Each structure stands twice: as C-alpha cells, then as structure tokens.
Symmetry: D2
Subunit: 272 residues, 4 copies
Amino acid sequence: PVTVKDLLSKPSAEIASFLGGIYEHSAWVAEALVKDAESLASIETISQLAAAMKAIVNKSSKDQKLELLCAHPDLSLTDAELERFNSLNGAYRDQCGFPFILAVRNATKHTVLAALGGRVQHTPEQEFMVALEQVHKIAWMRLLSKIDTSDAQGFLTCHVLDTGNGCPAEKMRIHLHRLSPPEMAGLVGEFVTNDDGRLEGGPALKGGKEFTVGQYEWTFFCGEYFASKGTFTSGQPFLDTIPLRFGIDNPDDHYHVPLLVSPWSFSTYRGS
Amino acid sequence: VTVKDLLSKPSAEIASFLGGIYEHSAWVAEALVKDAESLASIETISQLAAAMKAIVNKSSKDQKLELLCAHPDLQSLTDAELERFNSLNGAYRDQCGFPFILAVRNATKHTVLAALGGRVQHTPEQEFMVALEQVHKIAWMRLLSKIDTSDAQGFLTCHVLDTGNGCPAEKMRIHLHRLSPPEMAGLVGEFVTNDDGRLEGGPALKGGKEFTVGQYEWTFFCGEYFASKGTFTSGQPFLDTIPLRFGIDNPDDHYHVPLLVSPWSFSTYRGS
Amino acid sequence: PVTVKDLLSKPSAEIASFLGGIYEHSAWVAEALVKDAESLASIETISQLAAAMKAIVNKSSKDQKLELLCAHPDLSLTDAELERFNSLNGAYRDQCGFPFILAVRNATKHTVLAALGGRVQHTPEQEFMVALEQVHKIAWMRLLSKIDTSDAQGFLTCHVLDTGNGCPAEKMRIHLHRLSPPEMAGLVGEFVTNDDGRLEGGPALKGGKEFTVGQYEWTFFCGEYFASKGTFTSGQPFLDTIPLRFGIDNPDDHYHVPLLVSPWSFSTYRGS
Amino acid sequence: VTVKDLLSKPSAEIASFLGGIYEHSAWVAEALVKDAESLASIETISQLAAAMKAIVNKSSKDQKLELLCAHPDLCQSLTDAELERFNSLNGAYRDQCGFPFILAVRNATKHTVLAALGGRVQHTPEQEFMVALEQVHKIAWMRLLSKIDTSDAQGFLTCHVLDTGNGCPAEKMRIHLHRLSPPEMAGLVGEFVTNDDGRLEGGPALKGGKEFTVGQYEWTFFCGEYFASKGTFTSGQPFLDTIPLRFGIDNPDDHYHVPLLVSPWSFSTYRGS
C-alpha cells in the first residue's frame, strides 16, 4: 500500500497505471484523472482521491457510463439456488442491457439472491442508477486496499442521553469491540461516560492506525446505570446490556454513534 | 404447583404456601385467603402478585417499614471493593432506617456497587419508595419460582418497519436466541417477515413452555433487506446485521418487540 | 367523477378516452391499458388502476419514457428568484434532455426553487429516475380528481405508548383537525385513549367520505397525562401539548400514525 | 435584583428576600445565609435554587411533612359536576395522604388539575410524599424566577437536523421559531437556515437572559422543501412536509439543544444539552 502523498508525487503514467484497475476494465478513468494536473495537486486525502475519480465517471456521457457498466465483470449455492440465480441473472441483463452489479465484499449468498430477487423487478432506469452506485462502492473498496491510510484523521465519538429522566447518562460503562477483519478483531477499549454523557478520555478511536474500516460493536451497560438511579425496571429488566453493531466505511470521517435510552426504549443513528 | 391447583387447596394450606413471599410477613397471605371470593377471581400468577401487592400497599407506614426491616441484608469483589461495599451498606442502613434492598437475578458486582453507590446519595423518603418497589420485585421472583407457569398464555411478537421508505419490511430474515437462563439457552427460532412486516406464522414464542422469563436476542438481517431494494448503503454498511437484546419478566404478558429501521438508524421499544 | 367500477364497465374506447390525459399528451398509455381485457377485469380500486397504468409506462422503451417526459409541459417569485429559476431551468434541460418536472401539491415557490437548486446538480441518470417518479405522482393526483372515491375503505388509527414508563398511555386526550383542503378544514373529532393506548370508539376516520386526501394535525395532550401519573416534569414542561402534522395521500390505505413519548422525547412514523 | 446583586447584600437582607420561597419556611433561607462561603460560591439562579433544595432535602421527615402541610390547599371554568368531583377528590387525597394536594403547573387548565388529582389519588402515601416534594421544589423555582432579574443569564438554544433516510446532516432547510407563551412576549423570534453541518447558520437561535427566556416555543421545520431538493421520493400529498415542534424552556441558565431526526416517513426529537 502507498500513501496518497507518495502516489501523487509519481510521474503521470505511473499514477494512471496504479489507479487503472480501481474501476475494473475502465483504466480510462485514471487516465482522465492524471490529465488534470490542477485537480491532481489539490488531492490530499483518500476521500478526495475517490471523489475526483467519481466526478470523472459521473460527468461522462450516457454511452460511456453504459460501457463502464458492461465492462464490469459478471457476478456455495445449492443446486436449486444456482438454477434460480442463473435464471434471474440472465433475465436481468436481457432487460437492463448491462450486467447485475453488486458490491459483494461484505455480503453473503443470502445478500446476493435477495438483491437479484428484488432488483430484477425494477425498471432499467432505477437499476442504471443503482448499478452506478454499486460500481462507485466497489471502486472505493479497491482504493482502500491499495492506499495506506494510517495517517487518516477520522475518529469515533459517542453520547448517551437518558430519555427517561431527561439528562446525559453519567458514569455508564461502555465497551467497544472490533468484530472484523479477523486480523485486528477483539477488545478496543473499556470506557465510562462523564457528566456530559460523553466518553471520559475523548474519542474511543482516533486516526488511521486505530480508526480503521471494519465492523464494530458497542456494549452499553444500561442496566447498571438505571439501578444506580433507583429507576423502576422489571426484575428481569427489559433492557440490560445493549449491543450496538455498526460499520465504519471511511477512515477520513468523524463518526458520531450515540444512544438515546430509557428502561423501555432505545434508538441510535449515524451522526457526525 | 399451578395457580388454579393452588387456589383450590384449603385456605390454610394456601396461606402457608405463600407466607414467605414477603419475608417474615405471613399476614399478607392471611389477608389474601381471608376473602375467599376475591381469591376465586384470581386466574393468573400476575393477578395473584397484584393481589398480594395491593394488600401490602394499603397497609400502614409502620407496617411497611417493618416489612423492609424484615428483608435480609446482602465472591469476585477485590479487597478495596469489599471495603467500599461495607462502607456504603452501613451508611445506607443508618441514614434510611432499613437495609439496602436490590432485586436482581444473577447480579454482577458492578451492578450492586453502582446501585449502592448511587442510592446512598438519595433522600430516605425516595429510598423508602425505591425499597418497596424492590421488595415487590423480589416477591414476584419468589412467586415465579414456586408456581408452575407452564400454562401461562403470554407470547412474543415482532414487527419490522422501514422508516427510510415508509413501508413494512417484507421478507426480512430474523433469528431469535434465548441467552439466559443457561439450561435452555440456544437458537429458539428462524423467522421471515410477511407482506405486513410481521413474522410469518404468528408469534415467535407462545405460552409458558417456551415463552419463559429470561434474556433473549433478536438478530435482524437488515443488510439483505436493503440490498433487495437497491437502497444505498456504504460498502462497509453502517448497519446490516442488527442484534436486539431484551428481557422477558412476565410469562402472562404479550410482549411486542419491534424494529424501526433505516440504513442509518434504528429504534425499538417494549410494546404490547 | 365516476367510480372505478362504473368507469371500467364502459366500452374500451370510452375508457381510453377518459384516461387519455392522466399522463400528459400520452394517450397511448390508456389505449395500451384497455387491450388487456383480462387485466382490466381484475382492477377493483383506484390504487389498482393507478398501478396498472404505472406498470404500462414502466414496461415501455427508454425513448417512449423520454418522449413522455418531453411531452410534459415546462414549469409569487421576486426578480432575483425568477432569474434564478430561468437560469437553473434552462441549465437542467440542456443537461438532462428532458424538462424539469415537479409534482407540485399546489406547493410553494420555496419548494420549487429548492427542488431545482438541488436537482440541477444531479446526474442525468438520477434525474431520469426522479422525473419518472414525479410523472407518476402527477398521474395519481389527476386520477384522484377524476374518480369518485367516496366508497374507499381506508382509515386512520392511532396508538400512544409511554416510553418513560413502558406502557400504553391510557386516558390521554387527543384531538384531530383537518388543515386542508380548506373546504372541509376544521375539527374532525375529539378522542381519548383506552386501556391499550388506542382511540376509544375505533378509527378517527373511516371510509372515502371522511378519510379523504389532505393535511391533518393531531393534538396530543401529553402534559395532562404525565401529570396524572405524577411523572416528574419541569415547571414549564419540556413537552406539554404535542402537535403532529401529517398528510394522507391514498383513500384506499390504512394509515397508522402513532406516538411514542416520554416527558423528554417523542417519535412518530408512518405505520400500516 | 440580579443574583449577583442579591448575594452581595448583608445576610439579613438576603434571608428576608428569600424567606418565602418555601412556604412558611424561613428556616431554609436562614440555613442558607449562615454558610457564608458556600453562599459565596453561588453564581447563578440555578445554583441558588440547588442550594436551597439541598437544605430542604437534608432536613428531617418531620420538617418535610410540615413544609408540605404549610402549603395552601388549591380548593375557574369548572362545571357544577366537575366542581363536585374536584372537592371530592381533593378531600379524599388529603384524608389518605396527611398533606394537601400540591400541583406546580404554569397556567394549568382544569383538565390538567382534574387529571392530576384523579390519578394521584390512586397512589400510595409514600409515592405521593415524593411527588408532593417534587412539586414544592418546582414552586420554589417559579417564585425565585419571578423575584430575580434573570436578564443576565447565559443559557442558549441550539438546533441540529439529521436526515435519517440518507444518513447525513440536512443542509439548507428553512426553520422558523415562535414564542407561544407567555403571551406578552409571544411572536416570531427568528427565521433560520441549516448549514452543511445541519446546524443553524449563525449559531444559537436564542442567547442570553433577554431572549432565551422561560416559556413555550415552537419550531417550524420546512422538511418538504428539503426532501424536494434531494429528489427524495415523497407522496403527492407528502406524509411529512412542514413539521411543528412545540416545547418548553424551564431554565434560562441552561443550554437547550432541541434537534430534529427526520425522514419522509418518520421523525423524532429529544431534550438535549
């Protein structure tokens, strides 16, 4: 893997060859990028590099977009699952004019069948938009594999609000595990909230060496918290420990992933 | 001993069987069986618990205080933790006039310390109300352990709503595990949502043989569902597989524990 | 206006004449519809009629769809607003090859300028999907204007859950007003919740004569409810009376518009 | 008189000023002014209220019950039937509790009073003892607010809008804010737009004791325009377009954060900080 800064110090031909496979069988995207020295000089993050290449694709003609879709490679099933795949996969290409495209890196066989089963029912117009979204996702994940992002500045924060009592939840224990990829899976940290309901010690994860792409899981110990306030709960509490499973897709970004909670309800969302 | 079978026994037998539900307080049970026709209309363990609780709650302040003082006082604790515990417990008892009471099943030291550490900060009249709540919770636990509830008729239902698109989420795969108690932990079902976003085949669990007090976990495979719609999600999806951990406290009750979900948010609540 | 049943019993040529203007200058859609006599005999509601015409457009070729879009007419303003409109509107056409189309619910100039300001920045392929969506919305509204839906079977229900205490909210007062269209605007009813947190006496609105398309507003008297339970609230409560403003778009459908509420939070959603 | 002004006065003058905050309970103000350096650290009306509340809370049960009984019995537009039901409930309540029915509500309707009495008469005396004490503290807070000039308070109101359908801040959404009560200060108090962060352009909607004042407010979120700017699918008659958000501000010292979580098909809010 190479850093963004080192990659962009290379000669134009070398950069075009390095990035040539980001959009597979569409090396012309990378060629177009290096042709614009003005924009090449403004790129500093992997997010800006992806956005530049995405912009080239999105501003191209309909024919060139269609050619890009068709250039994309065609995608442990049981005998009947494989037969059904086959039929739907064929029906899709025939009616859309371009292949069924799906970002499968973090998917399973159930994901694929469900995607094909649903999207074969859509108009070619909706699917053209969906297919383009998929190729940009695939390109993003290929870019991440080739670029060293250890220097990224993204970070993960958390907030807990007690919606039963109307206050930040203070002194609540919070654990964080990394679930995937298998290389660095395991405990990331054990934290506690301050009087503002934020993690004591600041962000749970920060920077490209620990705020990395993958799947994570909070454990909020809400049962302990409510007991400390004497809040009424069932003897077998409706909510005790709350797992919150989420993915991080971009090492440049600030993810704020909070919890709103009462003894009888909770909610969370992708914040910033 | 089932509720129907118990309440058919001679009243002195009944008062003896229930005389320890509230510690050293056989007078509650005596008051209960004294009205043979109000007794006759008690049909479920919930109504039995409510009847005894009503006897306690209508008693005098002095009666209630003696009941608290009759309840018995409270492993892995470090020596520092043990000293803090003893210090807090002594402080509690001397400012309140009754012992520290906590209704929890298979508690952790973290729970006890947090509860004690927080509630020793409350006024004696708040703790009076909290202590009584705990004693009723303990009454419920004791009733559940002495009564055969296999004939209970509660049940568990689920609903999934796609808040991104404003429709029920159809054909979503859902698994259910029982986490506790250990003896019957394991996979208890694999489900799929119907056209209305409800479980195909009705309740996930029904009646006292399988809808039993304990801790459970839903697994919602939302990633498959979003992909079926071509809904935009990140390459590493923010949400795809969603765990929902919850407790069941009463085998008589209908528990409705739904999921409200978008690719970027989710919530739940204890419904009925 | 004519009912669906009475429309679809007329000769095929009268039907096509009747529906020739649903899609602007696209009489071929309706004429396509009537060639399917078996398909025609299946349609029972206005929802099913709309879906049938929608399906015909969705199965047509790209150039047909494009010509349908182009057949659509071009779309309070200040000097600066009008010149912004003209510039963006012109730019949009040159970019996409079809005019800017917006399903104006007699909406405001603010909606129009906002839509154009946002959508002029999209790719033509996303905009083609969006334009098609707008055309179908416009068709649906034209269909509602031509069809007598007085015998529609849709209805409105409500449910209130107290997430602060984990129970349905009983005996909460709830008012409902119609805001638009202005001819039928005003109070439609005053209600109270029952034991299950649902409206006493059933649905607030039922059938095509009272459950009609327009804007409505619930008024939930939550302050009164929390006071009745002695639930802690601020002297000036954070939540007292809660307005919930919502639109009904389809007289056939069941709208369930619930409230999840604590003294410190609330949520609602489009249920079915 | 500001808090700064008040607490810089001789202790006898402070005690006289605050002697009626709790009904017939001058002892509260007495205990307050005699800890002269705990007193000295009090900088805001919030802290002043907290200090007096603490004195009450640490008092004996006998002192607390006497404080409750010192409170006036609240026995308008009631019908004859409603008036009889009121007297009946209010009589029952005091009979079973040993102290009068106490309710701290700003401009309470008869519906509020009857609903409160109707519900709380079904509670145990020990639950109601807690509820009553919460009510007297709320009344103390109301009296402090009316006697003290809070124009120098430094609380403020912020807003954030999150698009939960797309997982992004909602940029360029128009947002209006009205004050609904008290009627003397009612009216439009601002028109705003969200920035790229989904927060109000120009910062807090209200700031400081002259505009961030106790009362009832209403946001108006123009979500229909926002969804249209994204090309997000909405119904011809949109389920959600213009969203009112009615809420109360109780403490001019505090930071109130009252955000909107929204999709075309759902929305939620909460009391943030």
